[PDB]
């Protein structure tokens, strides 16, 4: 009875503190910046071989190798320059939802509705790809996973928690609690010190890896958050939701900066990604196409309209010379 | 090109051949999703994710039981959905109706037909004969309900269980008729814990669904 009033007072204190710093907006300081103009991108490669909907995609660090997952139960590694296939990995369960590529290029991980994260070894003396370890402990389905090094990995699940794992022993070292709904997306900072998670409670949190405590909590969306991306400098969020809205958050001003929306868009958002310089923001929609946004102006610079179904995957290379998309029509396309 | 590129191309072609070979076998199995609440008797209808397999007339089926707002998106390619309701517990029929309404109107399931099982008829019949609990205590509209003249009761059944069974079936069907516009159909069935013919009903309903899809494909409907 007494703690609710204290919580309300603290929330009012935070709200009053945030309003005091809103001395300007992005839409006013950018009046002296020229528009990017019209951006045209065309398909350079088409990747065929999948027989079902594609759910996940991730680039390598060399900007040539690519890994993709589909509901047919197989994991494919592509050579983007020649369209040749490098490996084909059968899965023990066909209900896969995420995949990842190790920064050293030696391991790949995946998971889904089986509540298990599995790690595969790509460089063996026998010539075959084999499973190295299975990570168990979650109670819900697995929604996203990302490598930190060859021995550390972070996972997010639908049981409202996130975890940090030790691949050598298979034991969970830190558990992150504080969400009230299913956790959808993760994004790892360039300095490998903080990470961000979105959830179905329409909130975003910043986590400290080294201590396991939540540092900041952001709100504003009216529905579930589907994707989260990390601006290159380490000080911004990019989030997408099912209410057809994208928002930009800052970790130092601790509030929202700019909103990306349009009256003709009434579908959800599935993926968000940035360019190298951060000027362009890429987003996937259920309207069977992908839109290109100007991050500093909330305008529309272009559109990619080559798919015949929902867009589920989106990624950008480390050198910035290509963009890859994945859809439910069983096709992959490389844009430039 | 270099010789190593030719060998890589040969390896890629072999990988493509092996991928194509695997797809043919997968296409011969029909996939089903099982949904229902506790006490409904899901586990007995055909006796992270639980799986089961059965075969009728040289056709293979694969049924999945998960454990709903998020993971339902990945089951939009299944042939049909099976829903089980306990028809001998009046306190919880509104929960079942709300769940059925929430499933029927889901935006990702607009093209999937539903096979509806109304289970545990014997307990309902015993309770109706006993007269220790009345439907009118929970559904006031039942007092004005009359059995249709086109009813086909099973021989030997007292004309007090048919009224209740048809009232429940009408209550479930009326939701399905309010929306759908012909894109999917409901197939009501009455079952019990001891019935064994349940396998044939799924086979017939799936054959009918595929027939409807074929009719739509040839510009006949």
């Amino acid at each position, epitope marked *: 009875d007494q703690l609710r009033q204290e919580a309300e007072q603290l929330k009012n204190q935070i709200r009053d503190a945030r309003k005091a710093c809103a001395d300007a907006t992005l839409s006013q300081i950018t009046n002296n910046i020229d528009p990017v103009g019209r951006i045209q991108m065309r398909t350079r490669r088409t990747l065929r071989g999948h027989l079902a909907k594609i759910y996940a995609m991730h680039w390598g660090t060399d900007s*040539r*190798l690519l890994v993709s997952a589909s509901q047919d139960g197989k994991l494919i590694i592509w*050579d983007s320059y020649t369209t*040749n296939k*490098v490996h084909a990995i059968p899965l023990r369960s066909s209900w896969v939802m995420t995949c990842a590529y190790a920064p050293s290029g030696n391991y790949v991980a995946c998971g889904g509705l089986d509540n298990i994260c599995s790690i595969y070894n790509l460089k063996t*003396r*026998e*010539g*075959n790809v084999r499973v190295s370890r299975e990570l168990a402990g979650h109670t819900g389905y697995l929604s996203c996973c990302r490598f930190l090094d060859d021995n550390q990995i972070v996972t997010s699940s639908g049981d409202t928690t996130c975890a940090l794992w030790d691949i050598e022993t298979g034991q969970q070292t830190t558990t992150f609690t504080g969400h009230t709904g299913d956790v959808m997306s993760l994004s790892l900072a360039p300095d490998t010190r903080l990470f961000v998670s979105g959830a179905c409670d329409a909130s975003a949190k910043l986590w400290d890896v080294r201590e396991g405590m939540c540092r900041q909590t952001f709100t504003g969306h009216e529905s579930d958050i589907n994707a989260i991306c990390f601006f290159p400098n380490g000080n911004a969020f990019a989030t997408g939701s099912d209410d057809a809205t994208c928002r930009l958050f800052d970790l130092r001003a601790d509030q929202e900066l700019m909103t990306y929306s349009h009256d003709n868009i009434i579908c959800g958002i599935t993926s968000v990604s940035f360019s190298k310089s951060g000027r362009l923001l890429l987003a996937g929609y259920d309207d069977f196409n992908c839109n290109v946004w100007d991050a500093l102006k909330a305008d529309r610079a272009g559109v990619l309209a080559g798919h015949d179904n929902r867009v589920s995957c989106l990624g950008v290379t480390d050198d910035g010379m290509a963009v890859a998309t994945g859809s439910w029509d069983s096709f992959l396309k490389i844009w430039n | *090109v*270099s*010789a*190593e*590129d*030719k*060998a*890589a191309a*040969e*390896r890629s072609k*072999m990988i493509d051949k092996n991928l194509r070979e695997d797809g043919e076998k997968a296409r011969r199995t029909l996939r089903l999703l099982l949904l229902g609440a506790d006490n409904s008797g899901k586990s007995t209808i055909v006796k992270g994710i639980f799986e089961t397999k059965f075969q009728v007339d040289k056709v293979n089926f694969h049924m999945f039981d998960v454990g709903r707002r998020k993971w339902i998106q990945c089951f939009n390619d299944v042939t049909a959905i099976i829903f089980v309701v306990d028809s001998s517990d009046y306190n919880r029929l509104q929960e079942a109706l709300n769940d059925f309404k929430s499933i029927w109107n889901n935006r990702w399931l607009r093209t999937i037909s539903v096979i509806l099982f109304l289970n545990k008829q014997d307990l309902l019949a015993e309770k109706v004969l006993a007269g220790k609990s009345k439907i009118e205590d929970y559904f006031p509209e039942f007092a004005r309900y009359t059995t249709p003249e086109d009813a086909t009761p099973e021989p030997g059944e007292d004309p007090r269980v048919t009224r209740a069974k048809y009232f429940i079936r009408k209550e479930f069907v009326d939701i399905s008729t309010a929306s759908g516009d012909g894109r999917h159909i409901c197939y009501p069935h009455f079952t019990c814990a001891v019935d064994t013919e349940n396998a044939r009903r799924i086979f017939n309903d799936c054959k009918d669904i595929i027939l409807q899809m074929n009719l739509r494909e040839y510009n006949l409907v």
Partner: single-chain antibody, 230 residues
Framework: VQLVESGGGLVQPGGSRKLSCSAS????????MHWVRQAPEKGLEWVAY????????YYADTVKGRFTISRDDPKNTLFLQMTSLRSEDTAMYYC??????????????WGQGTTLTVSSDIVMTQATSSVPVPGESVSISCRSS???????????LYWFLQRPGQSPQLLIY???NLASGVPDRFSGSGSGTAFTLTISRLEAEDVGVYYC?????????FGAGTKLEL
């Protein structure tokens, strides 16, 4: 990972014999296979190549019409059929494993070998018979008749080391890539038609003959061989 060869013996001119190789410890069906011949006073010579799927087959210009290579995946065995043998065929025969994709190491493992007793090409040039020489730096050079730099950015030069009584071992592939299990004392560099091999500090295990090989076009060609005497 183990390859064992069988067959061999003494034959008369005009006869025939069949060789075999038994493989174990790896996915035999995913690898391509080669046969390499070494004469007592000639060095290494390539004979034939068979693909993993039996798709493509190549032969040397001195064995066409007389040698036949075959594969048996369910039994994990290799075969080489030889007819109308001549005096020039007396030599040691080796079996070599190869796999081809982006980033692979196509000449990583060599067999042990068997002995047989009877009774346009790119020229790879080495010229030094013996380099006398622990703890000192040694440089070995190779020179080719035609450039090995392809338009895709790759240069196809390979280095091998043969210790006394041992099979050749891979050190460097594609001129800069150190093979697995090799100590970091080895390095290599070059450009165009001139290549060098550098050893930072010699040990007692660095005594043997070093060979150069190109992989631009068939047939595959070897160098004369450079002997390092400690």
């Amino acid at each position: 990972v183990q390859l064992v060869e069988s067959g061999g013996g003494l034959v008369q001119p005009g006869g025939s014999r069949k060789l075999s190789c038994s493989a174990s410890g790896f996915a035999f069906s995913s690898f391509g296979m080669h046969w390499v011949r070494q004469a007592p006073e000639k060095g290494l010579e390539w004979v034939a190549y068979i693909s993993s799927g039996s798709g493509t087959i190549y032969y040397a210009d001195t064995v066409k019409g007389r040698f036949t290579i075959s594969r048996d995946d369910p039994k994990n065995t290799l075969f080489l059929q030889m007819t109308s043998l001549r005096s020039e065929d007396t030599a040691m025969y080796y079996c070599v494993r190869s796999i081809y994709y982006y980033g692979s190491s196509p000449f990583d493992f060599w067999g042990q070998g068997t002995t047989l007793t009877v009774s346009s090409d790119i020229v790879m040039t080495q010229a030094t018979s013996s380099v006398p020489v622990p703890g000192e730096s040694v440089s070995i050079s190779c020179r080719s008749s035609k450039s090995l730099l392809h338009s895709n950015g790759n240069t196809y030069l390979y280095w091998f080391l043969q210790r006394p009584g041992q099979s050749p071992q891979l050190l460097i592939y594609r001129m800069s890539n150190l093979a697995s299990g090799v100590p970091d004392r080895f390095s290599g560099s070059g450009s165009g038609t001139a290549f060098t091999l550098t050893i930072s500090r010699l040990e007692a295990e660095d005594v043997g003959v070093y060979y150069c090989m190109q992989h631009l076009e068939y047939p595959l060609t070897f160098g004369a061989g450079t002997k390092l005497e400690l």
